[PDB]
Amino acid sequence: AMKKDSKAPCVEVFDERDGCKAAGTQKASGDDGFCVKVSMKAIKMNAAEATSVTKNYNTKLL
C-alpha cells in the first residue's frame, strides 16, 4: 500500500573509472569504479522551487 509518509527510493549512480577518489566515500566492495546507492527517504517540500514555478511557469526552457 501507498503509506502516506512521502518516502521514496533515492538512487545515486557512481562511475569513478577516472580514478578520482574522495576521502571517506568507499562504502561498498569493488575496484572497477562502479557503485549504486539506494536509500528510502522522505521527499521534502521545496518552498523555493514552488515559489519559482508559481512565478515562472509560463516560460518555456530557453
Partner: protein, 177 residues
C-alpha cells in the same frame, strides 16, 4: 546479494545500501542492458529537479486555472505538495528502471493513490499532464532529444530502455486515470 536494492524498500533502519564490485556486477547481469540501464537511471536522478519543475510548469501553463483560487496548485503550500508528489513518482519510476520491474512502484506508490487524490480533489487531468511531460522529458534524455542538455555517454541506441521506462510511466497514468 540480489536483494541488496529491494531490502532497502522494506528496511526500518534508515540506512542506505551501497552496491559495488561483484555485487553490482551481478545485479547488472540480472537485468537487460545493465550499463545503458545505469546510464538511464543516472539520467533520471541527476536531473530530477528540472524534470519535476518543467513538468509541473507545463501542466500549469497549459491550464492556468490550476493556479487560480480554488485551483489544484493555488498557494505555495499546494504547489510544493505537487512538486513533491511528482518527484516521489519520478523516483519510484527510477527505481523500477534500476530493478527491472514495476512491483515496488505498484505496491508502495500507486496502491491507493487514486483514492487519496479523489478525496483531496487533486485533479486527474492535471496529474495526467504532469506524468506525460515527465515521461516525455525522460524519454528525451535517453533518446538524445534533449536540446538544452545531452547525456555524457558513449553514442548508441537506447530505444528499448526508453520503451521500458515509458511503460513504467504508463502504469502510473493507468492507476490514476
Amino acid at each position: 546479494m540480489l536483494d541488496a536494492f529491494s531490502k532497502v524498500i522494506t528496511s526500518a533502519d534508515g540506512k542506505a545500501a551501497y552496491v559495488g564490485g561483484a555485487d553490482l556486477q551481478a545485479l547488472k547481469k540480472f537485468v537487460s542492458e545493465g550499463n545503458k540501464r545505469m546510464d538511464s537511471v543516472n539520467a533520471i536522478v541527476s536531473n530530477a529537479s528540472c524534470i519535476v519543475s518543467d513538468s509541473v510548469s507545463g501542466m500549469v501553463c497549459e491550464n492556468p486555472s490550476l493556479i487560480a483560487p480554488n485551483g489544484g496548485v493555488y498557494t505555495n503550500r499546494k504547489m510544493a505538495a505537487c512538486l513533491r508528489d511528482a518527484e516521489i513518482i519520478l523516483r519510484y519510476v527510477s527505481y523500477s528502471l534500476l530493478s527491472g520491474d514495476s512491483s515496488v512502484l505498484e505496491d508502495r506508490c500507486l496502491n491507493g493513490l487514486k483514492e487519496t487524490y479523489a478525496s483531496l480533489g487533486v485533479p486527474a487531468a492535471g496529474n495526467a499532464r504532469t506524468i506525460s511531460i515527465m515521461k516525455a522529458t525522460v524519454i528525451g534524455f535517453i533518446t538524445n532529444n534533449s536540446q538544452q542538455k545531452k547525456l555524457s555517454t558513449p553514442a548508441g541506441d537506447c530505444s528499448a530502455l526508453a520503451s521500458e521506462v515509458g511503460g513504467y510511466f504508463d502504469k502510473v497514468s493507468s492507476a490514476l486515470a
